[PDB]
Every structure is written in structure tokens, then in C-alpha cells.
């Protein structure tokens, strides 16, 4: 998170981490207790997956084996264009005051909405700087052809853009994944941007969850 501020403690308990060699890999959100809502760019084949607390590396937390997770099958590498993941957890996660589900979406939020997007990813960019406590930064909603201007046909309408004018404020790497809440919803994940991170007037760009709330509830259905 660039240009951001830890996070109050104890307010973020549907965020997760995904990890792999004990490196945050990704973020990711807890749907329900069976499964991890994050990007399809974060596919391995297993994840250790962290609740339970703000701090990487803190003994209180959860670590939770995933073996199995699915893509949603439109999933482009070249274009990032449904970027969504579900990770199937080994043993349901147990629930808490730093243990909850998120709330999915009903509704799409309008652009102009202020948001806010959470994650352990590096706040700092090309050089990295990795936190152990969870950053967070307010964003606000970008309509989509103020965003159009900045990356042109390579925004579907499937993707959520966000950010504040002439302001670093922003997700990098290691967000992948995370959540961007609006007005108590999820409304993204973490998805794409620029490189170096924290440019200016270069929105970033989330996976429009409210797009996607059929498939979501399917997978899990399919896969329970």
C-alpha cells in the first residue's frame, strides 16, 4: 500500500494473507469458512493462508493449508480481465472478533464513492519496503471513461478503477488480491496498475466484484 497508514487494529478481520515459503504472496478476503476470495494472477498449486491478525509473522494468527482453488474460467493472462480466484481452505477457519466473513455486494457503488483498500504489499515502489503490521489508504471510485484516458481499450467493463487526483496514494505488489470495501461492501480485489507504483493519476485497478457474485456463489456450491 503506497502513501498509506496502518490499518486500526481489529478492523479488518475478513482480510487474509496467502503465503508461500513464509513471503506473503497475496491478499485475499474470507467469504465464508471454507473459502478465500483473491486474484487468479495468485494461482499455486498450495497456499498457507494467515487470519486472524493485523501483524505478518504473529503467533495468534491462523495458518490454514489450501490445496485446491479455482479461476474463473475467463481468466486472461494477457489482459487480466476476470482476474478472481476461489481458494478452498483444508480445515474450515474458526471464527472471531479477528476471524469474519465479508460482506459481498448487491450493488455496484457509483464512481466518486470513498473507498478503502488494505494489504501488506510494499510501500514503497521500484524499491521494496514490506510491512508486518496490515497498511490502509482511502481511495475514491474513478468512472470508467475518466479512467478509459489512462489505459485505454484495455479496461473491461468487468474492472473497477480507484485512486485520488495528483496522489501516490495506491496498492502495489503484494496486494494482489485484497479487498477495496465502499459503504460496508466488497466491491474489489486488487488486481493491476502501474509499475513503478504510486503514480500519480494512474488509477489502479480492482476486479469489479459485484460483477461476479453468480459465479462466486456457484464455485462455492460446486466445490463444497
Same mark, same amino acid.
Given at each position: ?56 509473522? *504473529? ?106 487526483? *495528483? ?34 493519476? *494512474? ?14 456463489? *456457484? ?6
Amino acid at each position: 500500500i503506497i502513501d498509506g497508514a496502518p490499518c486500526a487494529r481489529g478492523s479488518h478481520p475478513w482480510q487474509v494473507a496467502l503465503l508461500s515459503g513464509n513471503q506473503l504472496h497475496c491478499g485475499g478476503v474470507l467469504v465464508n469458512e471454507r473459502w478465500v476470495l483473491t486474484a487468479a494472477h495468485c494461482k499455486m498449486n498450495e497456499y498457507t493462508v494467515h487470519l486472524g491478525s493485523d501483524t505478518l509473522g *504473529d503467533r495468534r494468527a491462523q495458518r490454514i493449508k489450501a490445496s485446491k482453488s479455482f479461476r474463473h474460467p475467463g481468466y486472461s493472462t494477457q489482459t487480466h480481465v476476470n482476474d478472481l480466484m476461489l481458494v478452498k481452505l483444508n480445515s474450515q477457519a474458526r471464527l472471531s472478533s479477528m476471524v469474519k466473513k465479508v460482506r459481498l455486494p448487491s450493488r455496484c457503488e457509483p464512481p466518486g464513492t470513498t473507498c478503502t483498500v488494505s494489504g501488506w504489499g510494499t510501500t514503497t515502489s521500484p524499491d521494496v519496503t514490506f510491512p508486518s503490521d496490515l497498511m490502509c489508504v482511502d481511495v475514491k471510485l474513478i468512472s470508467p471513461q475518466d479512467c478509459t484516458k489512462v489505459y485505454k481499450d484495455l479496461l473491461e467493463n468487468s474492472m473497477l478503477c480507484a485512486g485520488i487526483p *495528483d496522489s501516490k496514494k495506491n496498492a502495489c505488489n503484494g496486494d494482489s488480491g485484497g479487498p477495496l470495501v465502499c459503504r460496508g461492501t466488497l466491491q474489489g480485489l486488487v488486481s493491476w496498475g502501474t509499475f513503478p507504483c504510486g503514480q500519480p493519476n *494512474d488509477p489502479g485497478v480492482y476486479t469489479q466484484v459485484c460483477k461476479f457474485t453468480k459465479w462466486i456463489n *456457484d464455485t462455492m456450491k460446486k466445490h463444497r
